[PDB]
Design a protein around this ligand. Structure first.
Ligand SMILES: Cc1cc2nc3c(=O)[nH]c(=O)nc-3n(C[C@H](O)[C@H](O)[C@H](O)COP(=O)(O)OP(=O)(O)OC[C@H]3O[C@@H](n4cnc5c(N)ncnc54)[C@H](O)[C@@H]3O)c2cc1C
Ligand SMILES: Cc1cc2nc3c(=O)[nH]c(=O)nc-3n(C[C@H](O)[C@H](O)[C@H](O)COP(=O)(O)OP(=O)(O)OC[C@H]3O[C@@H](n4cnc5c(N)ncnc54)[C@H](O)[C@@H]3O)c2cc1C
Ligand SMILES: c1cc2cc(-c3ncc(C4(N5CCCC5)CCCCC4)s3)ccc2[nH]1
Ligand SMILES: c1cc2cc(-c3ncc(C4(N5CCCC5)CCCCC4)s3)ccc2[nH]1
Ligand SMILES: c1cc2cc(-c3ncc(C4(N5CCCC5)CCCCC4)s3)ccc2[nH]1
Lengths: 485, 485
């Protein structure tokens, strides 16, 4: 039967499926490859976010921040036995595991008491345009155990870590394995400039044993591509100031094992480095190869993502795709938004589509980032006159903390014609929390004057966004100079 | 000496006015204050109450006090150290706060020194005549004249002063002013008042008290923090009690006597007794009109005691104005600052401006803190016929792991249900003050509840919860509460 079958019980899949059984009394199947977090498939019921993404990572960052809190407390008069201090990775992971497994179970409970909503363990594939094969493994020639007849098929299998084709890649891990290392690595190399590499660099930096060293490498000049440039250079500096070695214009060429089990990394430049863990975080790719999409001619974009329209529909009439598989904005709240939007269009004539512009996102680096809308060099290309407001203060408390390097950065980008805010980019503690309501402002087509005529809350870092009245420089036609001529 | 503007009180509102008039419109400005830096004998100084004995030093001290929690909470995330080696040094906190405040003092001098048309005068300002501010050596009219400043315009900006009740033994009590300079942290302390100052200091003393210590907060009425949201009022009461602070509602001191060792024997009106080492009165703050000689020129006061002003900060006497705490409206730094800016724009610029006093975001730095903007349920139910109340409250995952399960987060949105416009937002928990800032911008844009829940969330954050409340938890219709329509 089944009005809807969902392949992938993640952020997008679970929302679409719940908004259908409960909202419209439809019959829904959901397929995922595990009931609980962990090896060998890592992602499981709940999604990447719940099992090996946003949720456990936040807890681990929050754990890592305590290295700073402990150090910084001395400036405020706190003393304790310094050389009795121990960062217990194993207690942290155990505490993370129980937190995730609690959510695993709650969804398990959700399924086992909601009619029109049933869950099927195993690997979903596309047999025909109205049937989904639930096999036992990813092997297409493994035992079948269900064949779900479907009116509507939703593809929500998420994304998967990218690995470059070098010798020794088997000895490298991804973020997935990072969540389940039995020991915190003494020497670790995270590969890539993206947010995952940066966040884990901070986590490992906090929990590493004595004699330790995190190194982060990037093949190009400046990490965190696609983020505001001043923020990119500052985060680089502040990570450096907290002991992380940032190693740009380098890329691993091979990886051999040493006689102790550690990794001997050789870079393209000929430079070498011995580490205990090599974590590849060079990209996330859409997870399509186990779905047998060739069997029904489901089309892909030039980059291996499932092509869809503004209503999440493929070339195949009653097959849909949401979340990370579409290779767009890889964010849990967007995948959730797409899932809820997909349903009420199809199962309730409430035609909603998701807005992908001006979406607030964070990066829980130490220090963290918050961002919404366009960066300045992008805004310059589809607007005639762009204004950039910039304020970079060392917060109140870090004069005392001993963490003088912790500069807060606040940047607003406008179409200077009418002063509409196109972008807002924040660096420093609080940024992720500050930016959320900035999302709401941008959605209300807020102008710069709406910010600086708003009365500040003092003392806050957020305050700064209401204290910038005059541009620092402009972009006209795409050119950067200080004064408007 | 002849000037365009003479400002009495070099504080939040005063300085902003003087700086703006001098730097934006090239006017000749004199600013008067009794000290160039913080502390005894006059506490407030160049920079204002906020810089010297207010928002700035109290935040640093709250931040200091938060490390008690962080150190305890770190164990949940695998941090190990000798807990019996932990102790807080109060003199180091005070010393560090002193440096930070001093640098702002030092910075404000040098602003005067380098900006022409903007001069500082040390001493006590007063109205001799409608165009003459007299500066004397002391607050006493009999003291020697130092200057007689001719003025086209006079701005009164002397702030407020701690109200001290007229009970016997009041001499043995202190105010916030002296609390900032205590040589030792009080083992036992009574903070008298239900307002934000008392609460914040109770948290500070709670963290820094020595072994066997006890903070007690008393308040003559039933529930602390009048004017704030009732759930938050009741929660922060629980969370303070949960962290070891004894709350003493419906109680009020009647007298104080000295014990043999120098401690304080408080007797309440109810007859109950309590021994403490410090009694800090924070029962209110009253406009500082004592020493300004307002009767000489006939400046009128409100029946409440503040300087009466129209919406453009004008007194009854032409060319004499007043802003900030002396007007006895919203005793907040940014409001005074906005009032000063609006005043200088109007008088010396060619466009009238006035401070909007509604929908002003504000904070309380309890642990955890409050962030709030707009109306509370009860006030909204008098103004509007139909009122919705969206609510969300839970102990966040982080704190279930931390061990501080008492730390229940609270988000609330008050709406006029007729059109859905947000009238009030209220928050309790980590990052609340940072979150609420951009919420101030939203409300200025007359945002509706739909604009929040249709905005895409940032995950994982506390703020996210503001964009996830789609149906009212209850309603207020025609003034009456009900769980339904
Ligand atoms: C380390 C890390 C940190 C992140 N942090 C954040 C963050 O802070 N904020 C944020 O917004 N986003 C974050 N993300 C991204 C976020 O997790 C994804 O955007 C989100 O999970 C997308 O949801 P989805 O439904 O598209 O895919 P997912 O939620 O990943 O769901 C895919 C699910 O489908 C299952 N599956 C796959 N193939 C099959 C098959 N053939 N048959 C059956 N089941 C299958 C998988 O087991 C998986 O559980 C992070 C990602 C990573 C890797
Ligand atoms: C403990 C405490 C905590 C606070 N926390 C916050 C907060 O977190 N956020 C917030 O927004 N607000 C806070 N406030 C309120 C804030 O400090 C005031 O609202 C603000 O300082 C008012 O500024 P003002 O310009 O009215 O006068 P003030 O800033 O108070 O300055 C007035 C100045 O006038 C001087 N003066 C007085 N008499 C004379 C005279 N005769 N001649 C010359 N000079 C004179 C004084 O020395 C003083 O420096 C706090 C207040 C206190 C007491
Ligand atoms: C019986 C019902 C039941 C429901 C839940 C839910 N958890 C989260 C739920 C929600 N979504 C998120 C992922 C798909 C469901 C839907 C209702 C509340 C908002 C989250 S419902 C969890 C356990 C349950 N047991
Ligand atoms: C040496 C120090 C020095 C400091 C300043 C200022 N610091 C803060 C200033 C501002 N205010 C604070 C109170 C009214 C002026 C004015 C600019 C906006 C931010 C704060 S101006 C200006 C010139 C200075 N020369
Ligand atoms: C610049 C001046 C300055 C002055 C003080 C104090 N002055 C008086 C102080 C007090 N002295 C009395 C003798 C022991 C404590 C008296 C005022 C109340 C707090 C302590 S603290 C503290 C910090 C200061 N920085």
């Amino acid at each position: 039967a089944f009005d809807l079958v969902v392949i992938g019980a993640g952020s997008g899949g679970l929302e679409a499926g719940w908004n259908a059984a409960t909202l419209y009394g439809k019959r829904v199947a959901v397929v995922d490859v595990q009931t609980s977090h962990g090896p060998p498939f890592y992602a499981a019921l709940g999604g990447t976010c719940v099992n090996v993404g946003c949720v456990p990572k936040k807890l681990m960052v929050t754990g890592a921040q305590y290295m700073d809190h402990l150090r910084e407390s001395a400036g405020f008069g706190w003393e304790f036995d310094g050389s009795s201090v121990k960062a217990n990775w194993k207690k942290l992971i155990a505490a993370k595991n129980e937190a995730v497994l609690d959510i695993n179970k709650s969804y398990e409970g959700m399924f086992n008491d909601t009619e029109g909503l049933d869950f099927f363990l195993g690997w979903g594939s596309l047999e025909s345009k109205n049937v989904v094969v639930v096999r036992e493994t990813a092997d297409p020639k493994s035992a079948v155990k269900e064949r779900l007849q479907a009116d509507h098929i939703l593809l929500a299998t998420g994304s998967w870590p990218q690995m470059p084709a070098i010798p020794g890649i088997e000895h490298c891990i991804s973020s997935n394995e990072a969540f389940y290392l039995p020991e915190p690595p003494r020497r670790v190399l995270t590969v890539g400039g993206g947010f995952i590499s940066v966040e884990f660099a901070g986590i490992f930096n906090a929990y590493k044993p004595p004699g330790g060293k995190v190194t982060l490498c990037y093949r190009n000049n400046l990490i965190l591509r696609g983020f505001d440039e001043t923020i990119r250079e500052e985060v680089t500096k502040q990570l450096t100031a907290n002991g992380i070695e940032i190693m740009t214009n380098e890329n691993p060429a091979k990886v051999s094992l040493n006689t102790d089990g550690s990794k001997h990394v050789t870079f393209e430049s000929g430079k070498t480095l011995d580490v205990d863990v090599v974590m590849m975080a060079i990209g996330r790719i859409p997870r399509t190869n186990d779905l047998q999409l060739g069997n029904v001619g489901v089309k892909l974009t030039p980059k291996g993502g499932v092509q869809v329209d503004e209503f999440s529909r493929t070339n195949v009439p009653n097959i849909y795709a949401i979340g990370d598989i579409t290779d767009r904005l890889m964010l849990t709240p967007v995948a959730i938004n797409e899932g809820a939007a997909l349903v009420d269009t199809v199962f309730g004539n409430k035609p909603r589509k998701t807005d992908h512009t001006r979406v607030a996102s964070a990066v829980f680096s130490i220090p963290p980032i918050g961002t919404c809308g366009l960066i300045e060099e992008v805004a310059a290309k589809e607007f005639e006159k762009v204004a950039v407001y910039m304020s970079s203060f060392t917060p109140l408390m870090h004069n005392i903390s001993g963490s003088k390097y912790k500069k807060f950065v606040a940047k607003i980008v406008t179409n200077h014609s009418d002063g509409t805010v196109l972008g807002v980019h924040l660096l420093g503690d609080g940024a992720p929390e500050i930016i959320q309501a900035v999302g709401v402002c941008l959605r209300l087509n807020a102008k710069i004057s709406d910010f600086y005529n708003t009365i500040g809350v003092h003392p806050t870092s957020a305050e700064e966004l209401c204290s910038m009245r005059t541009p620092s420089y402009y972009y006209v036609k795409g050119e950067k100079m200080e004064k408007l001529p």
